[PDB]
């Protein structure tokens, strides 16, 4: 069923990113209010449409948001769900070499290692923005990330 | 080794020394290959191996193209002839009787098409922009097949325009849909649907829609008949 094949979809996103639950639920609801309140544009350019504009538009974000356009951020309702997902270390920290493959990643995110330019960040679902600083930090030292720096060419997206 | 005919004219399959099956065409210019392809003699007749990973037509065949409108003595207008890979295979298929008109607007590449077209009386090279069929109106004739593989966002529209100039009523159009050069943002599968609709909202009768995967990522080929 659509319920069913949905309960498929979710499990698809279940490592289309990396989660293990219904943080897909988290991000989901997010997308709602984002849209929702947003989609409640409605309306005109009410000086409100204004602040809210460059406002929610300043969703960008880094690793987050879109790229360069809008206005119409319902695109996100498409993305966000399927985009807001990445961004955060939960995603955009495998896609940077260090992490051998999502799993082999969250584990260091937790397990002390993996730190955002000073200070670790166990919160294994932070968010990224101006990333170039997402190194190991470590402070004999964070091993799994300090030598397996095959990320020395992690020119990815 | 063994070579034998297939459901489609002048298109053959090989049994190999090891037990592999690969497409090939009957070599119009024996002893001579256009890209690096393997030349194969069987019962004193030479065939050119047709690599599916390079040629979209070979791909579409291997993905089960019902009926191929390109055969012996067919007249084709080939939009986006490039270096001559695929067009050389349609030259083999069409034989001296038929004719291929290769339109291509990148000089860097028509350079290498020239070499292919010198050796082959079938092929009539044209350095022109497929967006202006007026600029080759005066060299071409009307045709049976409009084979269209051009990297352009409005590729479909270009194809329809050439069609109402050159495609015979009840002729066929093989149109390659390049998702990533129409829009890298959109889903390839949403693109295939909306482009086909352009053909239908003109008057092309969608016969078959193939997905070129393994062989070509984010590509689909449409076969349809102009009315």
């Amino acid at each position: 069923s659509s319920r069913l094949d949905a309960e498929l979809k979710l499990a698809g996103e279940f490592g289309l990113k990396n989660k293990k639950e219904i943080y897909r639920i988290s991000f989901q609801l997010s997308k709602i209010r984002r849209a929702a309140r947003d989609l409640l544009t409605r309306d005109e350019k009410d000086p409100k449409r204004l602040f809210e504009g460059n406002a929610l538009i300043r969703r960008l974000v880094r690793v987050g948001v879109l790229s360069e356009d809008k206005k119409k951020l319902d695109y996100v309702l498409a993305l966000k769900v399927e985009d807001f997902l990445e961004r955060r270390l939960q995603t955009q920290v495998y896609k940077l070499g260090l992490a051998k493959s999502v799993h082999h990643a969250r584990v260091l995110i937790t397990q002390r290692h993996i730190a955002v330019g000073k200070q670790i960040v166990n919160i294994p679902s932070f968010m990224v923005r101006l990333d170039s600083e997402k190194h190991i930090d470590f402070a004999r030292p964070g091993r799994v990330a300090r030598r397996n720096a095959a990320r020395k060419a992690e020119a990815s997206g | 080794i063994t070579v034998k005919q297939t459901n489609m004219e002048n298109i053959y399959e090989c049994e190999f020394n090891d037990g592999s099956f690969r497409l090939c065409t009957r070599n119009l210019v024996p002893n001579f290959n256009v890209y690096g392809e393997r030349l194969i003699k069987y019962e004193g007749v030479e065939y050119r191996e047709w690599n599916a990973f390079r040629s979209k037509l070979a791909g579409a065949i291997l993905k089960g193209l019902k009926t191929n409108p390109i055969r012996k003595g067919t007249k084709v207008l080939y939009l986006g002839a490039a270096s001559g890979t695929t067009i050389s295979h349609v030259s083999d298929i069409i034989e001296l009787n038929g004719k291929a008109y290769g339109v291509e607007f990148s000089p860097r590449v028509v350079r290498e098409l020239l070499l292919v077209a010198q050796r082959r009386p079938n092929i009539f090279p044209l350095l022109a922009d497929a967006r202006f069929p007026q600029s080759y109106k005066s060299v071409v004739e009307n045709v049976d097949v409009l084979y269209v593989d051009i990297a352009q966002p409005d590729q479909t529209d270009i194809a329809i325009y050439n069609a109402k100039f050159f495609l015979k009523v009840n002729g066929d159009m093989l149109l390659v849909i390049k998702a990533r050069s129409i829009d890298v943002t959109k889903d390839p599968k949403e693109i295939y649907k909306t482009e086909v609709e352009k053909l239908e909202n003109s008057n092309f009768e969608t016969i078959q829609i193939i997905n070129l995967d393994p062989y070509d990522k984010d590509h689909a080929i449409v076969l349809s008949k102009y009315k």
């Binding site: 330019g117 000073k118 170039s132 600083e133 190194h135 300090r146 030598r147 720096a149 | -």
Partner: protein
Amino acid sequence: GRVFRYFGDKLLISEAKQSFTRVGENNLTCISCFQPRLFAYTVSKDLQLTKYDITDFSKRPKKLKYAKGGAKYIPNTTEGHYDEILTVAASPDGKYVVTGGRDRKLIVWSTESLSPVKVIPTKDRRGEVLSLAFRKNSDQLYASCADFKIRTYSINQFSQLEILYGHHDIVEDISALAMERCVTVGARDRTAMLWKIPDETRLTFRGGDEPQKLLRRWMKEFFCEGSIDVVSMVDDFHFITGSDNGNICLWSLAKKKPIFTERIAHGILLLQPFWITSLYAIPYSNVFISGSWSGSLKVWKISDNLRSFELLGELSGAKGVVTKIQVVESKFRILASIAKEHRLGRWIANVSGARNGIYSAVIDQ
């Protein structure tokens, strides 16, 4: 802590005394001058550190002592360099000179014996040292590195104090005065950043302006910037940057955009601009000097209203790739390290009069 030195108009630049001193080394990457008997220190890709007496403005720099590193020193806490030395800074107290480069080590040497007294590793496999700057009248050292971090040190503790984060590319150049703060440039991030160490805050200034956009707003009445490469602080409230499109920009801490821009400051030679490869504002004055590989050192004067700068003159004996500029006084003496190559290995087609050594210019009034 502002600009109070107005000698720009007094400078007898046209009648400057110019000299050059060859070195047997390949590719000086940096020069550091000490000012209370005056000293200069040079470092090279050839792993040589060299000390000169420059106190006699009548004669060329007098070589006193040298120390050469090498393969022997492969580990990184050995007391010698084994990969390209990229930067050198003399301590304001006269006691220390510290070097750093591609072997991810700071090495602090005594000026007395030219011997390593302490080696402080960056502890990162990507932490190459790209630039050094002491806080003036202090032992506090700032090292800009290739892993996007700026590391701070207390030199008479021989320790690392902290690490600063913000840049999104290599931190090519760093400049500091007397305040506990510094300016850095991030190359391809096209930002300059002002670090207020005690306030734990930082200002961010952005370049990388689209030429089509610039032209579009100029029609209200040029060259693409891909990297901001050099930086120098003129006072505690202003600084200058130099880019690989020839732009020399004057910035105020209060403004988001540059308060003034001199485009293609070193000219061109379809069109390619000369990069700014060297930039030194003499502290709290209205003069600064710029260098490229175009054959001359341009000396500029800042307005008294700090809203512009203007070309004072040229020092045309300076052929080669200028890698670093320093100015000492007693009479001004400009010293500049000249190499056949760019400090960092950026590729340079035809450098005219390519050579290895130290350019000197003595200017009166």
